[PDB]
Amino acid sequence: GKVTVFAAASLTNAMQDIAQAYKKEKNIEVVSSFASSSTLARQIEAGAPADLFISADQKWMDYAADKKAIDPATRATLLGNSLVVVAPKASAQGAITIDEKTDWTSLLKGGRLAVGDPQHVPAGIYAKEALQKLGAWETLSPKLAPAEDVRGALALVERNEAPLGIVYGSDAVASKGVKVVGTFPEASHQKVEYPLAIVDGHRNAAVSAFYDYLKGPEASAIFKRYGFTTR
Ligand code: MOO
């Protein structure tokens, strides 16, 4: 048998490892299609034969639910991604406590904070949220190094060109050139969350069993290894 998963592309490597583990354990092929959450939600809306949908945000799963394309009795948040402060691997910077008393000016060592463009990059929007809530935005706003996406903000830090950056936990794990030096409190910003649901009409035995497996120990260990949080 086989199960077809439409999963946000940020989950590519985790999902591929889970597929190989599930094959070797249950002898069932997991077929994954990776693309943006927007792309997959519209494909599912138009009737694509996906069995499961894992979105990188609640918004696009809300969209699929509004179009009656996913089974709402099966929807639940599968993963989180922490919002983290990263530094270049070679930096003297050690891990520090992130709270209302963090001395951001001293941590910047004369440089700028790398972020996704807070006008539209989600990691930047969330960075801005957390910094405003913690009362640091007044200090940090004139000291930003905005980037076109998370990868561009990561590149500033990997090349020692910015002393700090704000990315997701899974981005930090995928980048060998950066190290986590702090984690924002989850309530300082909107939660980064990956909901999972069975696509409407696809709640059969084999789909349901892989659906359950994604929440079990083997899949959870793989997600954590890639820097996601589990539920
Ligand atoms: O899958 Mo997305 O484009 O990161 O929301």
Side-chain angles (χ1 to χ4, degrees), residues 1-29:
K2 78 286 199 163
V3 174
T4 299
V5 184
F6 284 13
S10 63
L11 311 167
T12 297
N13 287 135
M15 273 316 288
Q16 287 171 337
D17 293 339
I18 288 149
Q20 103 186 114
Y22 199 67
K23 183 78 181 63
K24 186 217 85 177
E25 254 157 356
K26 316 270 136 203
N27 195 29
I28 163 168
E29 211 204 350

PDB file of all heavy atoms in Angstrom, residues 1-29:
ATOM      1  N   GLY A   1       0.806  -1.209   0.000  1.00  0.00           N
ATOM      2  CA  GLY A   1       0.000   0.000   0.000  1.00  0.00           C
ATOM      3  C   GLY A   1       0.841   1.261   0.000  1.00  0.00           C
ATOM      4  O   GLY A   1       2.068   1.199   0.128  1.00  0.00           O
ATOM      5  N   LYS A   2       0.195   2.416  -0.149  1.00  0.00           N
ATOM      6  CA  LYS A   2       0.944   3.663  -0.164  1.00  0.00           C
ATOM      7  C   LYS A   2       0.074   4.801   0.350  1.00  0.00           C
ATOM      8  O   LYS A   2      -1.152   4.773   0.236  1.00  0.00           O
ATOM      9  CB  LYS A   2       1.497   3.989  -1.561  1.00  0.00           C
ATOM     10  CG  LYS A   2       0.503   4.562  -2.549  1.00  0.00           C
ATOM     11  CD  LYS A   2      -0.445   3.484  -3.063  1.00  0.00           C
ATOM     12  CE  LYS A   2      -1.125   3.897  -4.363  1.00  0.00           C
ATOM     13  NZ  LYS A   2      -1.712   2.724  -5.079  1.00  0.00           N
ATOM     14  N   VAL A   3       0.744   5.790   0.930  1.00  0.00           N
ATOM     15  CA  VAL A   3       0.147   6.991   1.487  1.00  0.00           C
ATOM     16  C   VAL A   3       0.829   8.180   0.830  1.00  0.00           C
ATOM     17  O   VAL A   3       2.056   8.182   0.668  1.00  0.00           O
ATOM     18  CB  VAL A   3       0.318   7.027   3.022  1.00  0.00           C
ATOM     19  CG1 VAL A   3      -0.167   8.346   3.598  1.00  0.00           C
ATOM     20  CG2 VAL A   3      -0.434   5.869   3.666  1.00  0.00           C
ATOM     21  N   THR A   4       0.044   9.173   0.421  1.00  0.00           N
ATOM     22  CA  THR A   4       0.572  10.360  -0.246  1.00  0.00           C
ATOM     23  C   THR A   4       0.474  11.551   0.698  1.00  0.00           C
ATOM     24  O   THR A   4      -0.622  11.894   1.157  1.00  0.00           O
ATOM     25  CB  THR A   4      -0.178  10.637  -1.551  1.00  0.00           C
ATOM     26  OG1 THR A   4      -0.023   9.517  -2.433  1.00  0.00           O
ATOM     27  CG2 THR A   4       0.373  11.878  -2.234  1.00  0.00           C
ATOM     28  N   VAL A   5       1.611  12.183   0.985  1.00  0.00           N
ATOM     29  CA  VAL A   5       1.665  13.328   1.887  1.00  0.00           C
ATOM     30  C   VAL A   5       2.026  14.568   1.079  1.00  0.00           C
ATOM     31  O   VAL A   5       2.980  14.544   0.295  1.00  0.00           O
ATOM     32  CB  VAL A   5       2.685  13.099   3.013  1.00  0.00           C
ATOM     33  CG1 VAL A   5       2.658  14.278   4.011  1.00  0.00           C
ATOM     34  CG2 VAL A   5       2.430  11.750   3.694  1.00  0.00           C
ATOM     35  N   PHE A   6       1.252  15.636   1.244  1.00  0.00           N
ATOM     36  CA  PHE A   6       1.642  16.960   0.773  1.00  0.00           C
ATOM     37  C   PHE A   6       2.182  17.717   1.974  1.00  0.00           C
ATOM     38  O   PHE A   6       1.439  17.982   2.924  1.00  0.00           O
ATOM     39  CB  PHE A   6       0.478  17.746   0.153  1.00  0.00           C
ATOM     40  CG  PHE A   6       0.074  17.301  -1.234  1.00  0.00           C
ATOM     41  CD1 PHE A   6       0.532  16.118  -1.778  1.00  0.00           C
ATOM     42  CD2 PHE A   6      -0.695  18.148  -2.029  1.00  0.00           C
ATOM     43  CE1 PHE A   6       0.169  15.742  -3.071  1.00  0.00           C
ATOM     44  CE2 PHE A   6      -1.055  17.785  -3.316  1.00  0.00           C
ATOM     45  CZ  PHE A   6      -0.621  16.588  -3.840  1.00  0.00           C
ATOM     46  N   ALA A   7       3.463  18.058   1.941  1.00  0.00           N
ATOM     47  CA  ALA A   7       4.120  18.650   3.094  1.00  0.00           C
ATOM     48  C   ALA A   7       4.898  19.892   2.687  1.00  0.00           C
ATOM     49  O   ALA A   7       5.610  19.885   1.680  1.00  0.00           O
ATOM     50  CB  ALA A   7       5.070  17.635   3.753  1.00  0.00           C
ATOM     51  N   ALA A   8       4.785  20.946   3.498  1.00  0.00           N
ATOM     52  CA  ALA A   8       5.604  22.138   3.306  1.00  0.00           C
ATOM     53  C   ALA A   8       7.066  21.760   3.092  1.00  0.00           C
ATOM     54  O   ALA A   8       7.590  20.848   3.736  1.00  0.00           O
ATOM     55  CB  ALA A   8       5.472  23.068   4.515  1.00  0.00           C
ATOM     56  N   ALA A   9       7.722  22.465   2.166  1.00  0.00           N
ATOM     57  CA  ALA A   9       9.043  22.045   1.714  1.00  0.00           C
ATOM     58  C   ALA A   9      10.099  22.103   2.816  1.00  0.00           C
ATOM     59  O   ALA A   9      11.123  21.418   2.708  1.00  0.00           O
ATOM     60  CB  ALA A   9       9.485  22.895   0.522  1.00  0.00           C
ATOM     61  N   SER A  10       9.885  22.904   3.862  1.00  0.00           N
ATOM     62  CA  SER A  10      10.840  22.925   4.969  1.00  0.00           C
ATOM     63  C   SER A  10      10.948  21.574   5.680  1.00  0.00           C
ATOM     64  O   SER A  10      11.935  21.340   6.394  1.00  0.00           O
ATOM     65  CB  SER A  10      10.466  24.029   5.963  1.00  0.00           C
ATOM     66  OG  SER A  10       9.191  23.797   6.546  1.00  0.00           O
ATOM     67  N   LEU A  11       9.980  20.676   5.488  1.00  0.00           N
ATOM     68  CA  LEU A  11       9.998  19.352   6.106  1.00  0.00           C
ATOM     69  C   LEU A  11      10.586  18.269   5.216  1.00  0.00           C
ATOM     70  O   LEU A  11      10.514  17.090   5.578  1.00  0.00           O
ATOM     71  CB  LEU A  11       8.585  18.942   6.540  1.00  0.00           C
ATOM     72  CG  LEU A  11       7.817  19.983   7.339  1.00  0.00           C
ATOM     73  CD1 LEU A  11       6.376  19.592   7.422  1.00  0.00           C
ATOM     74  CD2 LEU A  11       8.418  20.058   8.738  1.00  0.00           C
ATOM     75  N   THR A  12      11.212  18.641   4.096  1.00  0.00           N
ATOM     76  CA  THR A  12      11.672  17.659   3.113  1.00  0.00           C
ATOM     77  C   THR A  12      12.543  16.567   3.740  1.00  0.00           C
ATOM     78  O   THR A  12      12.274  15.371   3.579  1.00  0.00           O
ATOM     79  CB  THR A  12      12.437  18.369   1.990  1.00  0.00           C
ATOM     80  OG1 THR A  12      11.551  19.263   1.303  1.00  0.00           O
ATOM     81  CG2 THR A  12      13.010  17.359   1.022  1.00  0.00           C
ATOM     82  N   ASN A  13      13.602  16.958   4.445  1.00  0.00           N
ATOM     83  CA  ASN A  13      14.552  15.947   4.905  1.00  0.00           C
ATOM     84  C   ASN A  13      13.973  15.111   6.037  1.00  0.00           C
ATOM     85  O   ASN A  13      14.191  13.891   6.089  1.00  0.00           O
ATOM     86  CB  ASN A  13      15.862  16.605   5.333  1.00  0.00           C
ATOM     87  CG  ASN A  13      16.680  17.095   4.151  1.00  0.00           C
ATOM     88  OD1 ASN A  13      17.194  18.212   4.165  1.00  0.00           O
ATOM     89  ND2 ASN A  13      16.764  16.281   3.106  1.00  0.00           N
ATOM     90  N   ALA A  14      13.241  15.742   6.954  1.00  0.00           N
ATOM     91  CA  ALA A  14      12.594  14.983   8.017  1.00  0.00           C
ATOM     92  C   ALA A  14      11.618  13.976   7.432  1.00  0.00           C
ATOM     93  O   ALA A  14      11.624  12.796   7.795  1.00  0.00           O
ATOM     94  CB  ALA A  14      11.888  15.930   8.985  1.00  0.00           C
ATOM     95  N   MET A  15      10.798  14.422   6.488  1.00  0.00           N
ATOM     96  CA  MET A  15       9.776  13.554   5.931  1.00  0.00           C
ATOM     97  C   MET A  15      10.405  12.405   5.158  1.00  0.00           C
ATOM     98  O   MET A  15       9.876  11.288   5.142  1.00  0.00           O
ATOM     99  CB  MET A  15       8.879  14.373   5.013  1.00  0.00           C
ATOM    100  CG  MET A  15       7.745  15.051   5.732  1.00  0.00           C
ATOM    101  SD  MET A  15       6.847  14.071   6.941  1.00  0.00           S
ATOM    102  CE  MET A  15       5.974  12.985   5.841  1.00  0.00           C
ATOM    103  N   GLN A  16      11.522  12.670   4.482  1.00  0.00           N
ATOM    104  CA  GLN A  16      12.199  11.603   3.757  1.00  0.00           C
ATOM    105  C   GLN A  16      12.765  10.565   4.721  1.00  0.00           C
ATOM    106  O   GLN A  16      12.669   9.358   4.463  1.00  0.00           O
ATOM    107  CB  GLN A  16      13.290  12.182   2.854  1.00  0.00           C
ATOM    108  CG  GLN A  16      12.729  12.922   1.622  1.00  0.00           C
ATOM    109  CD  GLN A  16      13.804  13.668   0.848  1.00  0.00           C
ATOM    110  OE1 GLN A  16      14.860  14.003   1.389  1.00  0.00           O
ATOM    111  NE2 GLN A  16      13.533  13.947  -0.421  1.00  0.00           N
ATOM    112  N   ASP A  17      13.331  11.001   5.853  1.00  0.00           N
ATOM    113  CA  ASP A  17      13.797  10.022   6.840  1.00  0.00           C
ATOM    114  C   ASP A  17      12.629   9.234   7.433  1.00  0.00           C
ATOM    115  O   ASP A  17      12.730   8.015   7.634  1.00  0.00           O
ATOM    116  CB  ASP A  17      14.598  10.695   7.958  1.00  0.00           C
ATOM    117  CG  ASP A  17      15.927  11.271   7.472  1.00  0.00           C
ATOM    118  OD1 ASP A  17      16.420  10.828   6.411  1.00  0.00           O
ATOM    119  OD2 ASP A  17      16.510  12.118   8.186  1.00  0.00           O
ATOM    120  N   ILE A  18      11.517   9.909   7.731  1.00  0.00           N
ATOM    121  CA  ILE A  18      10.358   9.203   8.272  1.00  0.00           C
ATOM    122  C   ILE A  18       9.827   8.188   7.271  1.00  0.00           C
ATOM    123  O   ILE A  18       9.451   7.067   7.640  1.00  0.00           O
ATOM    124  CB  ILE A  18       9.263  10.199   8.698  1.00  0.00           C
ATOM    125  CG1 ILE A  18       9.687  10.955   9.958  1.00  0.00           C
ATOM    126  CG2 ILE A  18       7.900   9.501   8.838  1.00  0.00           C
ATOM    127  CD1 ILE A  18       9.124  12.351  10.009  1.00  0.00           C
ATOM    128  N   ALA A  19       9.777   8.566   5.992  1.00  0.00           N
ATOM    129  CA  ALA A  19       9.337   7.628   4.963  1.00  0.00           C
ATOM    130  C   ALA A  19      10.203   6.373   4.943  1.00  0.00           C
ATOM    131  O   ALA A  19       9.682   5.254   4.859  1.00  0.00           O
ATOM    132  CB  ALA A  19       9.349   8.302   3.592  1.00  0.00           C
ATOM    133  N   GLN A  20      11.527   6.528   5.021  1.00  0.00           N
ATOM    134  CA  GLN A  20      12.368   5.338   4.962  1.00  0.00           C
ATOM    135  C   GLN A  20      12.181   4.486   6.213  1.00  0.00           C
ATOM    136  O   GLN A  20      12.194   3.254   6.135  1.00  0.00           O
ATOM    137  CB  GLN A  20      13.848   5.705   4.760  1.00  0.00           C
ATOM    138  CG  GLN A  20      14.702   5.618   6.015  1.00  0.00           C
ATOM    139  CD  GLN A  20      16.133   6.111   5.831  1.00  0.00           C
ATOM    140  OE1 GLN A  20      16.541   7.122   6.412  1.00  0.00           O
ATOM    141  NE2 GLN A  20      16.908   5.380   5.038  1.00  0.00           N
ATOM    142  N   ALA A  21      11.965   5.120   7.371  1.00  0.00           N
ATOM    143  CA  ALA A  21      11.768   4.350   8.594  1.00  0.00           C
ATOM    144  C   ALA A  21      10.441   3.599   8.558  1.00  0.00           C
ATOM    145  O   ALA A  21      10.366   2.441   8.981  1.00  0.00           O
ATOM    146  CB  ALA A  21      11.835   5.266   9.818  1.00  0.00           C
ATOM    147  N   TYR A  22       9.390   4.244   8.043  1.00  0.00           N
ATOM    148  CA  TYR A  22       8.073   3.614   7.979  1.00  0.00           C
ATOM    149  C   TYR A  22       8.054   2.488   6.953  1.00  0.00           C
ATOM    150  O   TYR A  22       7.379   1.471   7.150  1.00  0.00           O
ATOM    151  CB  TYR A  22       7.007   4.669   7.645  1.00  0.00           C
ATOM    152  CG  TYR A  22       5.586   4.265   7.980  1.00  0.00           C
ATOM    153  CD1 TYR A  22       5.181   4.101   9.299  1.00  0.00           C
ATOM    154  CD2 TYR A  22       4.642   4.076   6.980  1.00  0.00           C
ATOM    155  CE1 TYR A  22       3.872   3.732   9.612  1.00  0.00           C
ATOM    156  CE2 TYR A  22       3.332   3.724   7.287  1.00  0.00           C
ATOM    157  CZ  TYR A  22       2.954   3.541   8.600  1.00  0.00           C
ATOM    158  OH  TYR A  22       1.651   3.174   8.890  1.00  0.00           O
ATOM    159  N   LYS A  23       8.770   2.659   5.839  1.00  0.00           N
ATOM    160  CA  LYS A  23       8.906   1.570   4.876  1.00  0.00           C
ATOM    161  C   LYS A  23       9.545   0.347   5.518  1.00  0.00           C
ATOM    162  O   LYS A  23       9.042  -0.777   5.393  1.00  0.00           O
ATOM    163  CB  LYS A  23       9.736   2.028   3.679  1.00  0.00           C
ATOM    164  CG  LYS A  23       9.876   0.981   2.581  1.00  0.00           C
ATOM    165  CD  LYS A  23       8.640   0.881   1.708  1.00  0.00           C
ATOM    166  CE  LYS A  23       8.814  -0.199   0.636  1.00  0.00           C
ATOM    167  NZ  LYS A  23       8.982  -1.566   1.216  1.00  0.00           N
ATOM    168  N   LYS A  24      10.660   0.545   6.213  1.00  0.00           N
ATOM    169  CA  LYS A  24      11.380  -0.596   6.749  1.00  0.00           C
ATOM    170  C   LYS A  24      10.611  -1.263   7.880  1.00  0.00           C
ATOM    171  O   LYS A  24      10.789  -2.460   8.119  1.00  0.00           O
ATOM    172  CB  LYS A  24      12.773  -0.150   7.202  1.00  0.00           C
ATOM    173  CG  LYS A  24      13.686  -1.273   7.662  1.00  0.00           C
ATOM    174  CD  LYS A  24      14.554  -0.862   8.841  1.00  0.00           C
ATOM    175  CE  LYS A  24      13.826  -1.052  10.163  1.00  0.00           C
ATOM    176  NZ  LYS A  24      14.696  -0.723  11.328  1.00  0.00           N
ATOM    177  N   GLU A  25       9.725  -0.532   8.549  1.00  0.00           N
ATOM    178  CA  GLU A  25       8.979  -1.081   9.671  1.00  0.00           C
ATOM    179  C   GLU A  25       7.655  -1.701   9.230  1.00  0.00           C
ATOM    180  O   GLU A  25       7.289  -2.783   9.704  1.00  0.00           O
ATOM    181  CB  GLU A  25       8.731   0.019  10.702  1.00  0.00           C
ATOM    182  CG  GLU A  25       9.585  -0.101  11.956  1.00  0.00           C
ATOM    183  CD  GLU A  25       9.744   1.231  12.696  1.00  0.00           C
ATOM    184  OE1 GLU A  25       9.253   2.259  12.181  1.00  0.00           O
ATOM    185  OE2 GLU A  25      10.370   1.252  13.787  1.00  0.00           O
ATOM    186  N   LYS A  26       6.933  -1.049   8.310  1.00  0.00           N
ATOM    187  CA  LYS A  26       5.584  -1.464   7.948  1.00  0.00           C
ATOM    188  C   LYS A  26       5.434  -1.910   6.503  1.00  0.00           C
ATOM    189  O   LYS A  26       4.353  -2.379   6.134  1.00  0.00           O
ATOM    190  CB  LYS A  26       4.589  -0.325   8.218  1.00  0.00           C
ATOM    191  CG  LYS A  26       4.800   0.383   9.547  1.00  0.00           C
ATOM    192  CD  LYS A  26       4.008  -0.273  10.664  1.00  0.00           C
ATOM    193  CE  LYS A  26       4.841  -0.412  11.927  1.00  0.00           C
ATOM    194  NZ  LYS A  26       4.317  -1.496  12.806  1.00  0.00           N
ATOM    195  N   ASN A  27       6.475  -1.772   5.679  1.00  0.00           N
ATOM    196  CA  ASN A  27       6.439  -2.125   4.253  1.00  0.00           C
ATOM    197  C   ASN A  27       5.343  -1.379   3.499  1.00  0.00           C
ATOM    198  O   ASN A  27       4.639  -1.947   2.665  1.00  0.00           O
ATOM    199  CB  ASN A  27       6.294  -3.631   4.039  1.00  0.00           C
ATOM    200  CG  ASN A  27       6.629  -4.037   2.618  1.00  0.00           C
ATOM    201  OD1 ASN A  27       7.433  -3.384   1.950  1.00  0.00           O
ATOM    202  ND2 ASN A  27       5.991  -5.095   2.136  1.00  0.00           N
ATOM    203  N   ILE A  28       5.197  -0.091   3.772  1.00  0.00           N
ATOM    204  CA  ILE A  28       4.263   0.744   3.032  1.00  0.00           C
ATOM    205  C   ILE A  28       4.992   1.984   2.547  1.00  0.00           C
ATOM    206  O   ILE A  28       5.706   2.635   3.317  1.00  0.00           O
ATOM    207  CB  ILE A  28       3.026   1.103   3.875  1.00  0.00           C
ATOM    208  CG1 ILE A  28       2.276   2.292   3.270  1.00  0.00           C
ATOM    209  CG2 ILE A  28       3.388   1.274   5.294  1.00  0.00           C
ATOM    210  CD1 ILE A  28       0.927   2.511   3.878  1.00  0.00           C
ATOM    211  N   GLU A  29       4.827   2.294   1.268  1.00  0.00           N
ATOM    212  CA  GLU A  29       5.520   3.413   0.646  1.00  0.00           C
ATOM    213  C   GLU A  29       4.822   4.724   0.980  1.00  0.00           C
ATOM    214  O   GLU A  29       3.628   4.889   0.710  1.00  0.00           O
ATOM    215  CB  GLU A  29       5.583   3.221  -0.867  1.00  0.00           C
ATOM    216  CG  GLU A  29       6.822   3.833  -1.503  1.00  0.00           C
ATOM    217  CD  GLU A  29       6.627   4.161  -2.978  1.00  0.00           C
ATOM    218  OE1 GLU A  29       5.600   3.747  -3.559  1.00  0.00           O
ATOM    219  OE2 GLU A  29       7.499   4.848  -3.553  1.00  0.00           O
TER     220      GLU A  29
END
